[PDB]
Amino acid sequence: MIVPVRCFSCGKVVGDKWESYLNLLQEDELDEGTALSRLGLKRYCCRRMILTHVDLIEKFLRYNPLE
């Protein structure tokens, strides 16, 4: 629902990177791996979750009980 703070393999902290990643993709559109590669992701299992994990919370906050 929100990027797991650690991966399922390394468990290196992912959390900081998602925002910084996503921004780094939107601002200054750049190659994915290279982004991560110069964002500091090396291990591919670490990497998959930034290349993956569609965020469902932002598509949820469309729906909320309170509005």
Partner 1 sequence: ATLKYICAECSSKLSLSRTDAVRCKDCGHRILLKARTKRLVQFEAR
Partner 2 sequence: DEINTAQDKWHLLPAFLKVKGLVKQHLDSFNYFVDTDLKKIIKANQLILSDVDPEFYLKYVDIRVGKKSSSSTKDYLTPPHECRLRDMTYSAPIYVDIEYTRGRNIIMHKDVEIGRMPIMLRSNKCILYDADESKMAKLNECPLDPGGYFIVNGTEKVILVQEQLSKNRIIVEADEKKGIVQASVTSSTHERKSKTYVITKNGKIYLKHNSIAEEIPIAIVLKACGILSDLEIMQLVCGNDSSYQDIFAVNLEESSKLDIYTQQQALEYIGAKVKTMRRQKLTILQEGIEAIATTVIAHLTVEALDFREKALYIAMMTRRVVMAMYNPKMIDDRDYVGNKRLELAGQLISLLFEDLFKKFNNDFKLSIDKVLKKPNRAMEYDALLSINVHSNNITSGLNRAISTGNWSLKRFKMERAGVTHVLSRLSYISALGMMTRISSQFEKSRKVSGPRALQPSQFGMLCTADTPEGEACGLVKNLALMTHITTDDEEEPIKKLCYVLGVEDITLIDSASLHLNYGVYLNGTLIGSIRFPTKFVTQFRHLRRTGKVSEFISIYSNSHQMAVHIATDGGRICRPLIIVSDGQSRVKDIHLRKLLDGELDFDDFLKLGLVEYLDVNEENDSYIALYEKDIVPSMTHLEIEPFTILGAVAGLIPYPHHNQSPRNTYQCAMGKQAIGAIAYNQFKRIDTLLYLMTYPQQPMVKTKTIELIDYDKLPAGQNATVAVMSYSGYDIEDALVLNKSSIDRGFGRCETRRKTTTVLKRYANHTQDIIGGMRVDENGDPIWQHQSLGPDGLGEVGMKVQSGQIYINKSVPTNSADAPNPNNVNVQTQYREAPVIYRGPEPSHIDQVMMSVSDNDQALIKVLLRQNRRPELGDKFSSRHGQKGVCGIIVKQEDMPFNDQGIVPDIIMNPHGFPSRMTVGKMIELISGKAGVLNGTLEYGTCFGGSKLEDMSKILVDQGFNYSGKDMLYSGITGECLQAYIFFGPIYYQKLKHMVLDKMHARARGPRAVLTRQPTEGRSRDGGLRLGEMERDCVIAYGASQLLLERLMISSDAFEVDVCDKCGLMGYSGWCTTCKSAENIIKMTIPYAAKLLFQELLSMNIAPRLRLEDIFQQ
Q: Which residues are annotated as a binding site?
A: 7, 10, 45-46
Write each residue from 1 to 40 as x if it is in contact with partner 2 (CB under 8 A), else as -, in one continuous string: x--x-xxxxxx-------------------xxxxxxx---
Q: Yes or no: say if 22 and 2 are a contact pair by the CB < 8 Å rule.
A: no
Under rule CB under 8 A, residue 65 binds partner 1: yes
Q: What are phi and psi of 63, to 5 degrees?
A: -85, 120
DSSP 43: S
Under rule CB under 8 A, residue 48 binds partner 2: yes
Q: Yes or no: say if 27 and 20 are a contact pair by the CB < 8 Å rule.
A: no
Between 61 and 66, CB nearer to partner 1: 66
